[PDB]
Every structure is written in C-alpha cells, then in structure tokens.
Amino acid sequence: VNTIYIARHGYRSNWLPEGPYPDPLTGIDSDVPLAEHGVQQAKELAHYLLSLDNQPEAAFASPFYRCLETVQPIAKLLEIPVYLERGIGEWYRPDRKPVIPVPAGYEILSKFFPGVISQEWDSTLTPNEKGETEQEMYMRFKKFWPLFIERVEKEYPNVECILLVTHAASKIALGMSLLGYDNPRMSLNENGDKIRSGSCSLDKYEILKKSYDFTYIPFSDRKWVLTMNGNTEFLSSGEEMNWNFDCV
C-alpha cells in the first residue's frame, strides 16, 4: 500500500434543526443514519473518487451505520469491496452517557447494506468498550496502523491504494499517527495548519518514494506525506461541521 485515502462520513440526521429524529436502525445508541443531505454528499464523494487516476481498490469502514451508508455509493460505483474495521470506529470518552456505543457486526449490517460488505475481514482491534481517554485513543491508532497495514498486505498483496471511512476525531488521529506526530492536537506545520474534517471530507496520504520509478519496505520504515487535506471542493455543500480537538 502506497496511497491511503481517509474520508469522514456524511451529514448526520441528528444535526437537523428539528425532530423527529430517526432512531438507529441497529438499535445501538447514537448509531444514527445520514440525513438526506448527507446521502447526497456521499454520492458526490463517490463521483469524485471515481474520477481519480489513483482510485482506491478496497474500502475499510467504521461499522457505525453512518459510515456504511457513506461508503455504500462509493463501493457500488467503484466496484470495490468493503470491510468492517472496528479499529477505526468512533472515539467515546469514559463516562460518556447514557452508554458507550459499540457498533454492530456483519450479521446485522449486511441486512441493511446487501451485497456491499465482505465478511472475511476481521477487525484489527476493538476500541475499549468502556471508552478511551484522549491519550488512550491516540495509542489505539498508533498500535492500529502497523497491524492493519501488515494484514492488508498479507491478505490483498496486489492492493496499492485503499480508502478508510471514519469519524471526525478518528480521521484526525489516524492522520496524525500515520504522519508520526507526538499527539493529535499539534499543528502540522509552522503555518498552523491542521487536518480538516468536515462531513464527507477527504484526506490523501502517499509514501515518500525510496526508489526511482520489488523491494519490500516494512510499514514502520515508510514515511507518509499528506497530499490532500480535508478536501470538500467536490461537494455542492462545501465544508460543513469541521471538527478539531479544540472542540473538546
């Protein structure tokens, strides 16, 4: 794998100004569906990814419903498999109320998204079901990356470009840990830039090349470069609901 795209799911139903708000179809607390506005964003994200020379060849999704609903049009249009990855699920802190949500598995989600999800992929790890402190959450992602890419490359040796569909904090923490920063709150550079994470925004990471255009490079020896930061130019909505750690 030499290219990684990371997207946030689309606009959430609970963000609309008034109820009634649809109940989670899975029965899981706060596992809400996309707003219609968010389904439109997901379709526009799909069409943008379709247009790329360097398209993802496989998608890994947080098993929260809103992430599956976002990846569905992407997978159908690009004709790529979708794998459930608990490792990139939402960040909940301990004592979050009323409960810490734990997302559903294949048995349940395959009913809502028929023909989309491949069962063969098991999760790389499972976030603490009692929640995670900020430090623990970032450690979750530092641990996740080498285990995850090692498995991807064993299972799908010919896949060079992948997509992850995830949540706001997880998207930023994934990117900051991939890039090797000490913590996810830091700025990227002296300009003060941060990874932007609007709904259906899209990040791209590429490896720094070690040869002129096979020599295996362990994941831990690869240097990644952020080459697209929270792009929403392909959305008719533009950027909505940007989140960063200043929001906590």
Order the strands of the 3-8 sheet from edge to edge. 82-84, 58-61, 161-166, 3-8, 202-207, 224-231
Report the Cα 229 to chain-centroid distance in Å. 14
Q: In the block, which residue shows the tokens 């899975």?
A: 26
Declared resolution, Å: 1.5
CATH homologous superfamily for the domain 1-248: Phosphoglycerate mutase-like (3.40.50.1240)
- Experimental technique for the deposited model: X-ray
* C-beta separation of 2 from 206 below 8 A: yes
Q: In the block, which residue shows the tokens 């809103």?
A: 66
**Domain residue spans in the chain?**
1-248
